[PDB]
Design a protein around this nucleic acid. Structure first.
Ligand SMILES: [Zn+2]
Ligand SMILES: [Zn+2]
Ligand SMILES: [Zn+2]
Ligand SMILES: [Zn+2]
Lengths: 79, 73
DNA sequence: CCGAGGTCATTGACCTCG
DNA sequence: CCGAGGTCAATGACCTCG
């Protein structure tokens, strides 16, 4: 609402796992860690992640989350 | 490459008499089936793109009918 | 071969709670 | 207020079929 998402640039409510992010990138990082999914990029691993094409490549989207300093340990275990 | 005339994404061919993508193809199919009526919270002037197609469903369905998506099935 | 139809795993807006 | 957690309808990649 008052913050910018550090991954795609969408409206961010606050910090999630240490970084300003939106509801979309927050859940995407949680889903990847809780299920330990491994993604595979279909291009040169340089897909652009923005408001409109963040869902393009799951690999480069998760790599930007780690690049922006999202702590994987910040994800608790399923209750 | 050819783009979807509704949102500008990579079109997957002609769907319902329009060159659209898999996203707009599925959305236009669900809209006519459910006879859904939407209400825009931005005054019905949302510019359609890959990001705005998930936000406003009124300006999206209007864009599809403006691009000639027929509903005879 | 395309585009009708369909399924269904992912997405993200909207929550509780300490 | 902040950042964890959570649900779930809509979404869209991908399927079969005529
Ligand atoms: Zn984001
Ligand atoms: Zn990629
Ligand atoms: Zn489209
Ligand atoms: Zn609108």
């Amino acid at each position: 609402t008052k913050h910018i998402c550090a991954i795609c640039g969408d409206r961010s409510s606050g910090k999630h796992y240490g970084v300003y992010s939106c509801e979309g990138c927050k859940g995407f990082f949680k889903r990847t860690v809780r299920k330990d999914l491994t993604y595979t990029c279909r291009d040169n691993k340089d897909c652009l992640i923005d408001k409109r094409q963040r869902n393009r490549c799951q690999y480069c989207r998760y790599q930007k989350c780690l690049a922006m300093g999202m702590k994987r340990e910040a994800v608790q275990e399923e209750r | 490459d050819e783009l979807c005339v509704v949102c500008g994404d990579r079109a997957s061919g002609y769907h319902y008499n329009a060159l659209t993508c898999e996203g707009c193809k599925g959305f236009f199919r669900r809209s006519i089936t459910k006879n859904a009526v939407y209400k825009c919270k931005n005054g019905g002037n949302c510019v359609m793109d890959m990001y705005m197609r998930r936000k406003c469903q009124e300006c999206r369905l209007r864009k599809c009918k403006e691009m000639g998506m027929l509903a005879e099935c």
